[PDB]
Enzyme design. Structure first.
Site, PDB file in Angstrom:
ATOM      1  N   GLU A 795       0.856  -1.180   0.000  1.00  0.00           N
ATOM      2  CA  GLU A 795       0.000   0.000   0.000  1.00  0.00           C
ATOM      3  C   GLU A 795       0.894   1.232   0.000  1.00  0.00           C
ATOM      4  OE1 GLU A 795      -3.779  -0.737  -0.063  1.00  0.00           O
ATOM      5  OE2 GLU A 795      -2.343  -2.076  -1.020  1.00  0.00           O
ATOM      6  N   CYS A 829      -0.692   9.695   3.944  1.00  0.00           N
ATOM      7  CA  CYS A 829      -0.720   9.225   2.563  1.00  0.00           C
ATOM      8  C   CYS A 829      -1.960   9.731   1.832  1.00  0.00           C
ATOM      9  CB  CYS A 829      -0.667   7.700   2.529  1.00  0.00           C
ATOM     10  SG  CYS A 829      -1.902   6.921   3.602  1.00  0.00           S
TER      11      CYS A 829
HETATM   12  N1  LIG Z   1      -1.411   3.549   0.900  1.00  0.00           N
HETATM   13  C1  LIG Z   1      -1.326   3.644   2.374  1.00  0.00           C
HETATM   14  O1  LIG Z   1      -2.151   3.149   3.073  1.00  0.00           O
HETATM   15  C2  LIG Z   1      -0.144   4.445   3.020  1.00  0.00           C
HETATM   16  C3  LIG Z   1      -0.227   4.763   4.358  1.00  0.00           C
HETATM   17  C4  LIG Z   1       0.761   5.492   4.974  1.00  0.00           C
HETATM   18  C5  LIG Z   1       1.874   5.848   4.230  1.00  0.00           C
HETATM   19  N2  LIG Z   1       1.978   5.497   2.920  1.00  0.00           N
HETATM   20  C6  LIG Z   1       3.201   5.908   2.182  1.00  0.00           C
HETATM   21  O2  LIG Z   1       4.231   5.724   2.932  1.00  0.00           O
HETATM   22  C7  LIG Z   1       5.289   6.849   2.493  1.00  0.00           C
HETATM   23  C8  LIG Z   1       5.864   7.501   3.755  1.00  0.00           C
HETATM   24  O3  LIG Z   1       6.099   6.577   4.810  1.00  0.00           O
HETATM   25  P1  LIG Z   1       7.649   6.079   5.017  1.00  0.00           P
HETATM   26  O4  LIG Z   1       8.557   7.315   4.857  1.00  0.00           O
HETATM   27  O5  LIG Z   1       7.838   5.396   6.342  1.00  0.00           O
HETATM   28  O6  LIG Z   1       7.951   5.042   3.725  1.00  0.00           O
HETATM   29  P2  LIG Z   1       9.329   4.232   3.378  1.00  0.00           P
HETATM   30  O7  LIG Z   1       9.164   3.617   2.021  1.00  0.00           O
HETATM   31  O8  LIG Z   1      10.495   5.175   3.363  1.00  0.00           O
HETATM   32  O9  LIG Z   1       9.580   3.060   4.530  1.00  0.00           O
HETATM   33  C9  LIG Z   1       8.504   2.267   5.010  1.00  0.00           C
HETATM   34  C10 LIG Z   1       9.170   1.029   5.704  1.00  0.00           C
HETATM   35  O10 LIG Z   1      10.061   0.267   4.607  1.00  0.00           O
HETATM   36  C11 LIG Z   1      11.239   0.009   5.166  1.00  0.00           C
HETATM   37  N3  LIG Z   1      12.234   0.060   4.110  1.00  0.00           N
HETATM   38  C12 LIG Z   1      12.973   0.989   3.523  1.00  0.00           C
HETATM   39  N4  LIG Z   1      13.690   0.363   2.570  1.00  0.00           N
HETATM   40  C13 LIG Z   1      13.381  -0.954   2.586  1.00  0.00           C
HETATM   41  C14 LIG Z   1      13.834  -2.034   1.822  1.00  0.00           C
HETATM   42  N5  LIG Z   1      14.839  -1.841   0.752  1.00  0.00           N
HETATM   43  N6  LIG Z   1      13.356  -3.243   2.041  1.00  0.00           N
HETATM   44  C15 LIG Z   1      12.415  -3.450   3.031  1.00  0.00           C
HETATM   45  N7  LIG Z   1      11.973  -2.417   3.775  1.00  0.00           N
HETATM   46  C16 LIG Z   1      12.467  -1.154   3.541  1.00  0.00           C
HETATM   47  C17 LIG Z   1      11.419   1.166   6.144  1.00  0.00           C
HETATM   48  O11 LIG Z   1      12.289   0.888   7.169  1.00  0.00           O
HETATM   49  C18 LIG Z   1       9.977   1.364   6.685  1.00  0.00           C
HETATM   50  O12 LIG Z   1       9.716   0.458   7.856  1.00  0.00           O
HETATM   51  C19 LIG Z   1       4.623   7.722   1.742  1.00  0.00           C
HETATM   52  O13 LIG Z   1       4.948   7.478   0.270  1.00  0.00           O
HETATM   53  C20 LIG Z   1       3.162   7.452   1.985  1.00  0.00           C
HETATM   54  O14 LIG Z   1       2.343   7.821   0.911  1.00  0.00           O
HETATM   55  C21 LIG Z   1       0.974   4.793   2.281  1.00  0.00           C
HETATM   56  O1  LIG Z   2      -7.144   8.106   5.811  1.00  0.00           O
HETATM   57  C1  LIG Z   2      -6.239   8.337   6.634  1.00  0.00           C
HETATM   58  O2  LIG Z   2      -5.657   9.437   6.782  1.00  0.00           O
HETATM   59  C2  LIG Z   2      -5.762   7.191   7.613  1.00  0.00           C
HETATM   60  C3  LIG Z   2      -4.479   6.505   7.130  1.00  0.00           C
HETATM   61  C4  LIG Z   2      -4.911   5.082   6.717  1.00  0.00           C
HETATM   62  O3  LIG Z   2      -4.450   4.164   7.699  1.00  0.00           O
HETATM   63  C5  LIG Z   2      -6.451   5.136   6.690  1.00  0.00           C
HETATM   64  N1  LIG Z   2      -6.767   6.109   7.763  1.00  0.00           N
END
Ligand SMILES: NC(=O)c1ccc[n+]([C@@H]2O[C@H](COP(=O)([O-])OP(=O)(O)OC[C@H]3O[C@@H](n4cnc5c(N)ncnc54)[C@H](O)[C@@H]3O)[C@@H](O)[C@H]2O)c1
Ligand SMILES: O=C(O)[C@@H]1C[C@@H](O)CN1
Ligand SMILES: Cc1cc2nc3c(=O)[nH]c(=O)nc-3n(C[C@H](O)[C@H](O)[C@H](O)COP(=O)(O)OP(=O)(O)OC[C@H]3O[C@@H](n4cnc5c(N)ncnc54)[C@H](O)[C@@H]3O)c2cc1C
Ligand SMILES: [Mg+2]
Length: 1218
Positions: A795, A829
């Site tokens: 996600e 996100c």
């Molecule tokens: N679609 C959703 O529900 C949702 C929800 C929240 C955040 N996000 C996305 O998450 C991003 C921000 O959160 P973030 O900065 O923690 O994301 P990130 O990709 O930088 O890291 C997320 C996790 O992946 C791990 N990671 C990094 N490199 C890895 C690798 N090579 N292999 C395995 N794991 C690795 C990190 O340690 C972390 O636990 C944003 O792009 C946001 O849009 C999506």
């Molecule tokens: O919509 C939002 O902001 C939060 C982030 C996701 O876990 C779904 N609930």
């Protein structure tokens, strides 16, 4: 460095005994409020008989002079349907926007009447049709069927011509100039007040301002009040505060941040403005009344009332007035406070007793916030008893206050008239009523020939634009099924019914004061399915005082996060965790996991997998429910940790802990609905989570995997290990064995080491698309022991847009934009990244948006007054700033708040607005407080939806419009997983807006939705409510083609796939009032088919077509000759692909072959550009043996849509609840 939470939310003043009694009643159970009100409202049998007789006489007079309204006579004369009547009034409204009378009359005569009105009148004629609908039909319809109204308007004009247009224009002119307002300007209103003042009425003018959005708005409302006070005081000419006119004000009009969270700004900036207006009212000796608004502003307004009444500069004047709302549980205690304040100050406070104007909004707000109870009654008769009880209190204190009984209810009036008894003088008390509404009743009250009691008329003053803004709320005051004015007009309601005594009816009830049967307490929103999480009322001083201490205590704790292996904590590299809003504030210490120990943890999980899978599903779900209870109990301490570790505000931390509790309880209930012995776990599941929802998404992934029977390796984001460790502690306390849940703190290579470990049977990833793509590639060289792909839920990011047309209400838009874009410093996100404004309204909304931007308070988040906290790291800050400066360097307009010097000790980015030329100016998700704004022409709306879709993302999407045609067009053509209509686009609620996107935004299935757990087992169960009676017609054509070719078995399998598909599922999910939350199953899009055999191709095609998809078939399969002479319907859905990367993007894939063919195809699929593809593979033999070789759950796409049905200003469904 300031001590954490040392200044979190200090009250304006120490809370007196009288103030504390108010706060104690805030959400008191309804059964507890009523008995003392019944006692206070009791009167003698003689009085009750006299009151009933008086009420009957008043009602007989009202029904005896009642004539048909002008709109009714208009509808009758021209035989208009309801839609025609509404369309006519919308046309009249639009014609009255032409200021010059001759010009308007020429347009009517020469253009409007003679055919096409469309050619002559950027803004739909029907923007306010919901309001006119209430006027014509008495019923509120939340959105406007503008195609129906356009048809009706064409029909009525072509049928009736100029005469009906003329009559509509004259009617709307009278209603909008003389009925909904007393006058357009204060001078006009004053001129028209002489007639009834000569009869013994008085006036209080309502200048119709409220809800300032910007400093400029507040200044405009201020100078409007000031100029009105001069005109009223000049006209009063020494008549004094009882005989002469006064003004009413709304505090929300006088400051853009009027709230308890901003109490210091309110007392420093709003209070002097009220004092200046009061000083002017004192000099003219007129009344100045403070209107009552939402429940969370009541107690704050008391602090202003107190200071003003104690201020010696206002001494000598008794004109200060204050509204109290009898539908509120605090009302008698508020009155006790006001009466005591009047005694202390020596000011004879003018107290207007009302019932209350915000009822349905208060119901929705308490439900959304998960609070203990409502701050208002839920049965209308309870408000009536409360009103009469509070009137008894006021009538006992007429020496110190001036009671003003505002009501249109003849029974209420009569009860109080006799309660007040025989002695009367002007100045003792008065009645009040609304202009254009209450005069028929009070012309039977005022005057020596009637009851000889005075009535003050509350007189709205304003232009058409001003009166229409909240006219719906005013119409519902007297227009709901339980409203007196509506009932007196109902011939099926007898006078005996109308003079029924609410005090004695309530007294005789079986359970005195019981909650309304049809209104759910917030905890019971989901009924028997599960218990709603509970929030906290940050407007409640007891809550703020208790939270202050819990938060301080949380900051004194030595939080740690360690590698918690099955065998115990492991040694590692230890470092501190620093508050992102102030790096001097050490939150705790994390010991991070070696790559050796991460590999060891997976082997331990594998060894422990059978023991955890053998815990029966109901008992695994009981662990989740126990964990939810523990998190609920520990919420205050969890808040403090989230606030300091992750840079969140208190409101956002509450929502975060609530979402964790909701995940636990939702997945527990979904488990109890589905999981049986044949739904075997995958095995060890690696859960990798982001920093920005460090408890909710962390807990959600782990809870789902655990309850599906899988042991979990939990790898939290490196930025936020402490709250993750506490979540794991809670889950273990709740009964999750240490071998089933191991915590592996550390960075991405701890994540990668876990993903690459040989025994990893599944991966749940939430984070950036780039990292998900690296995990996808890792897993592409991997097969399960059964030779199938390792499931990946990924996600990922969004590029979320909101489209706003010229029918939306700017104030609503701006509030939803400010929240969606800058809540959590844009680090959701779901956050709004691109605002799309229709050209005709873009400059007005942009001005308001920039004004609202500069009212945000940015800082360290251990203060309630902080709206926006820090970004999580210096690297995040540098990345966001680089984007901003690039945009600035290209000449784009950039608006930024100035940051306080105190932010220098942390990592902050100011909320920012960037004006773009085209959507393509954005290239990647910018994960910070940066809103981009584009403008569009209304005819280019469909192209704009294309542009939004063209980013490749598809997470959240918002639409602000009143127009059904635009809703239908936009929501059918947008491709995103979470749609929001007339509300913000953040804070999706578990089980209500199942959350998750498509394309570059996710693989699905949705977290918080019913398909989620089925991805975490080897054989997916049938989710609750998961079915569809619809059969895809291309699937049917294909099954017939197969029968024509002799492929009888495949034809039967195709028909079975058509029935088994849940494509077309369309459900409404239970949630709060005032919102419709919809959940639908659609096609995913184009599915890549990689067949090996003819039969395999036919099964793959059946699966894809039954779920509504098109396909691209691998041309290298050599199976072209198996699909000769397809029906054109099926051919339209079929393409052949030699170069898969050229023919994407795909939305999934189906693969046939042996284990090494599957591995090879999986590697080639992972190399395709763009979205991660949900791949399903099967051998030829599996396709022959298992009808579910390809699971149809993963070939449909979930869509959640949340519609704010209260956006027009009221709740239609709650108009029937009394
Ligand atoms: N679609 C959703 O529900 C949702 C929800 C929240 C955040 N996000 C996305 O998450 C991003 C921000 O959160 P973030 O900065 O923690 O994301 P990130 O990709 O930088 O890291 C997320 C996790 O992946 C791990 N990671 C990094 N490199 C890895 C690798 N090579 N292999 C395995 N794991 C690795 C990190 O340690 C972390 O636990 C944003 O792009 C946001 O849009 C999506
Ligand atoms: O919509 C939002 O902001 C939060 C982030 C996701 O876990 C779904 N609930
Ligand atoms: C002169 C004047 C000044 C006013 N000033 C204000 C103001 O400053 N602030 C404010 O909030 N409103 C204000 N009002 C509105 C007032 O609060 C009522 O909403 C409205 O006037 C109708 O109440 P009623 O006594 O006329 O009629 P009724 O038909 O007797 O009462 C209707 C009221 O019952 C209540 N009610 C309806 N359903 C339920 C239910 N299921 N459970 C519990 N209660 C229910 C609501 O308050 C509703 O408005 C004012 C009204 C007047 C006439
Ligand atoms: Mg990262």
């Amino acid at each position: 460095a300031p001590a954490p939470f040392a200044d979190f939310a200090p009250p304006v003043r120490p809370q007196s005994t009288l103030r504390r009694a108010i706060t104690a009643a805030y959400r008191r159970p309804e059964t507890e409020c009523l008995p003392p009100l019944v006692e206070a409202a009791t009167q003698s049998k003689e009085i009750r008989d006299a009151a009933a007789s008086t009420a009957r006489k008043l009602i007989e007079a009202l029904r005896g002079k009642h004539s048909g309204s002008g709109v009714e006579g208009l509808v009758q004369e021209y035989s208009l349907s309801s839609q025609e009547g509404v369309a006519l009034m919308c046309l009249a409204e639009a014609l009255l926007r032409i200021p010059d009378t001759a010009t308007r009359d020429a347009l009517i005569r020469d253009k409007i009447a003679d055919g096409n009105w469309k050619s002559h009148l950027s803004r739909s004629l029907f923007v306010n049709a919901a309001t006119w609908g209430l006027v014509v039909t008495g019923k509120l319809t939340s959105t406007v069927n503008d195609r129906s109204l356009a048809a009706a308007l064409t029909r009525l004009i072509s049928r009736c011509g100029e005469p009906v247009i003329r009559r509509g224009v004259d009617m709307a002119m009278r209603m909008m100039g003389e009925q909904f307002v007393t006058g357009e300007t204060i001078r006009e209103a004053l001129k028209r007040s002489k007639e009834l003042e000569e009869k013994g009425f008085s006036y209080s003018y309502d200048m119709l301002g409220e809800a300032a959005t910007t400093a400029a708005d507040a200044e405009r409302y201020y100078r409007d009040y000031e100029s009105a006070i001069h005109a009223i005081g000049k006209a009063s000419a020494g008549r004094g505060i009882y005989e002469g006119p006064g003004i009413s004000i709304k505090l929300s009009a006088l400051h853009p941040r009027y709230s308890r969270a901003q109490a210091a700004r309110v007392m420093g900036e709003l209070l002097p403005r009220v004092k200046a207006l009061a000083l002017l009212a004192k000099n003219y000796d007129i009344g100045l009344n403070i209107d009552a608004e939402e429940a969370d502003r009541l107690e704050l307004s008391l602090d202003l009332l107190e200071v003003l009444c104690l201020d010696g500069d206002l001494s000598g004047w008794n004109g200060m007035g204050f509204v109290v709302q009898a539908y509120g549980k605090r009302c008698p205690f508020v009155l006790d406070f006001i009466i005591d304040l009047a005694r202390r100050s020596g000011r004879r406070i003018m107290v207007r007793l009302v019932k209350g104007a915000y009822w349905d909004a208060e119901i929705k707000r308490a439900q959304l916030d998960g609070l203990a109870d409502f701050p208002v009654f839920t049965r209308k008769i309870h408000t009536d008893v409360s009103y009469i009880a509070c009137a008894a209190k006021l009538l006992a204190a007429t020496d110190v206050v001036f009671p003003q009984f505002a009501t249109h209810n003849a029974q209420t009036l009569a009860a109080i008239y006799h309660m007040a008894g025989k002695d009367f003088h002007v100045g003792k008390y008065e009645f009040q009523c609304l202009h254009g509404m209450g005069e028929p009743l009070y012309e039977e009250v005022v005057g020596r020939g009637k009851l000889d009691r005075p009535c003050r008329i509350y007189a709205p003053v304003g232009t058409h634009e001003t009166l229409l803004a909240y006219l719906v709320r005013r119409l519902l005051e007297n227009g709901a099924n339980s409203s007196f004015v509506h009932r007196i007009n109902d011939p099926k309601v007898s006078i005996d019914e109308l003079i029924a005594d609410p005090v004695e009816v309530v007294r005789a009830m079986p359970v005195v004061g019981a909650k309304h049967d049809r209104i759910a307490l917030p905890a019971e929103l989901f009924g028997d399915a599960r218990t709603n999480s509970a929030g906290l009322d940050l407007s409640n001083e007891e809550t703020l005082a208790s939270l202050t201490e819990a938060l301080r205590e949380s900051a004194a704790m030595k939080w740690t996060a360690l590698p918690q292996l099955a065998t115990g904590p492991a040694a590692g590299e230890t470092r501190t965790v620093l508050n992102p809003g102030d790096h001097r504030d050490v939150v705790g210490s994390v010991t991070e996991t070696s790559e050796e120990d991460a590999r060891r943890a997976v082997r331990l999980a594998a060894d422990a997998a059978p023991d955890w899978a053998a815990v029966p599903p109901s008992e695994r779900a009981a662990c989740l429910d126990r964990a939810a209870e523990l998190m609920q109990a520990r919420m205050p301490t969890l808040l403090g940790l989230i606030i300091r570790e992750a840079g969140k505000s208190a409101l956002n931390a509450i929502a975060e802990v609530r979402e964790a509790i909701d995940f636990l309880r939702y997945y527990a209930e979904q488990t109890r609905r589905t999981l049986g012995p044949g739904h075997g776990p995958l095995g060890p599941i690696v859960c990798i989570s982001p920093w920005n929802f460090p408890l909710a998404i962390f807990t959600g992934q782990i809870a789902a995997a655990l309850v599906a029977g899988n042991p979990v390796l939990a790898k939290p984001a490196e930025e936020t290990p402490l709250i993750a460790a506490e979540g794991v502690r809670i889950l273990r306390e709740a009964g999750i064995p240490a071998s089933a849940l191991q915590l592996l703190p550390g960075d991405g290579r701890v994540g990668a080491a876990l993903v690459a470990a040989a025994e990893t049977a599944g991966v749940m990833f939430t984070g950036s698309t780039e990292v998900a793509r690296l995990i996808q590639a890792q897993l592409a060289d991997r097969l399960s022991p059964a030779g199938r792909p390792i499931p990946l839920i990924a996600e990922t990011g969004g590029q979320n847009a909101m489209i706003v047309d010229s029918s939306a209400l700017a104030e609503q838009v701006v509030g939803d934009v400010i929240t969606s874009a800058f809540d959590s410093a844009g680090q959701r996100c779901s956050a709004l990244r691109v605002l799309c404004l229709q050209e005709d309204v873009a400059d007005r909304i942009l001005t308001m948006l920039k004004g609202a931007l500069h009212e945000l308070h940015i800082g360290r988040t251990d203060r309630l007054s902080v709206d926006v906290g820090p970004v999580i790291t210096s690297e995040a800050k540098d990345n966001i700033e680089k984007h901003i400066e690039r945009m600035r360097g290209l000449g784009r307009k950039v608006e930024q708040i100035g940051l306080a010097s105190e932010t220098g000790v942390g990592t902050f980015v100011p909320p920012t607005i960037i004006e773009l030329e085209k959507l393509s100016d954005l290239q990647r998700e910018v994960f910070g407080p940066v809103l981009h704004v584009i403008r569009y022409r209304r005819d280019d709306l469909d192209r704009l939806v294309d542009d939004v879709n063209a980013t490749g993302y598809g997470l959240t999407f918002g639409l602000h419009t009143r127009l059904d045609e635009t809703i239908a067009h936009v929501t059918s053509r947008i491709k995103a997983g979470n749609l929001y209509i007339n509300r913000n686009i953040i804070g999706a609620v578990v089980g209500v807006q199942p959350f998750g996107g498509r394309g570059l935004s996710g693989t699905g299935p949705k977290a918080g939705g019913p398909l989620y757990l089925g991805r975490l087992v080897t054989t997916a169960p049938v989710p609750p409510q998961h079915s569809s009676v619809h059969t895809d017609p291309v699937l049917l054509d294909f099954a017939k083609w197969l029968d024509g070719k002799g492929a009888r078995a495949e034809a039967e399998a195709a028909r079975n796939a058509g029935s088994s598909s849940a494509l077309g599922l369309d459900l409404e999910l239970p949630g709060p009032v005032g919102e419709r939350n919809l959940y639908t199953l659609h096609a995913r899009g184009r599915i890549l088919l990689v067949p090996a055999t003819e039969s395999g191709l036919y099964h793959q095609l059946a699966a894809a077509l039954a779920t509504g998809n098109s396909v691209a078939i691998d041309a290298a399969s050599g199976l072209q000759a198996s699909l000769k002479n397809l029906p054109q319907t099926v051919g339209l859905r079929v393409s052949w692909s030699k170069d898969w990367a050229a023919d994407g993007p795909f939305a999934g894939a189906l693969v046939e072959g042996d284990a090494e063919r599957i591995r090879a195809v999986n590697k080639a699929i992972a190399a395709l550009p763009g979205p991660l593809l949900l791949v399903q593979a099967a051998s030829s033999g599996e396709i022959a043996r298992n009808p579910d070789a390809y699971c149809l759950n993963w070939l449909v796409e979930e869509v959640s849509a949340s519609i704010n049905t209260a956006a027009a200003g009221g709740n239609a469904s709650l108009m029937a609840i009394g």
